[PDB]
């Protein structure tokens, strides 16, 4: 807790993504656990 909401710029399909939070920092995340590559599509709001 908490669940830091970022906004998804784009995924690279290999189990990583580039997100840009509203709190401002960009982070090189992993697509991993209780999430899929089909559920992630630009402009979506993702849970970190």
């Amino acid at each position: 807790n908490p669940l830091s909401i970022g906004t998804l710029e784009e995924i690279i399909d290999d189990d990583h993504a580039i997100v840009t939070s509203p709190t401002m920092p960009d982070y090189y995340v992993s697509i991993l656990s209780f999430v899929d590559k089909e559920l992630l599509e630009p402009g979506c709001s993702v849970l970190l």
Binding site: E9, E10, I12, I18, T20, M24, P25, D26, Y27, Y28, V29, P42
Partner: protein
Amino acid sequence: PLQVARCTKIIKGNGESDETTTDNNNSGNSNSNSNQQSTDADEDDEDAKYVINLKQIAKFVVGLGERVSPTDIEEGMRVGVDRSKYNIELPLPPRIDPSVTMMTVE
């Protein structure tokens, strides 16, 4: 995670004046920090260095990781740097100026 940065200027690490410690100009040609001392006349500081600008808007001088070489890293190219201490881990696809462009591919 990795803090996403983006390189702003390759400033090569020899000829950066990254040795001032040796204050002697009687030794060396003194055109570069590896030519500050002429005993070796060669590496006394990293070969290549980089200035990045984070996306928190703070610039730092970062150098070479152990799995990237300068063939891999270029000016204007997004990089990922370690979140706690900044140093290029992995190069990423060009710019953050892209956004509508990812729409346009159909």
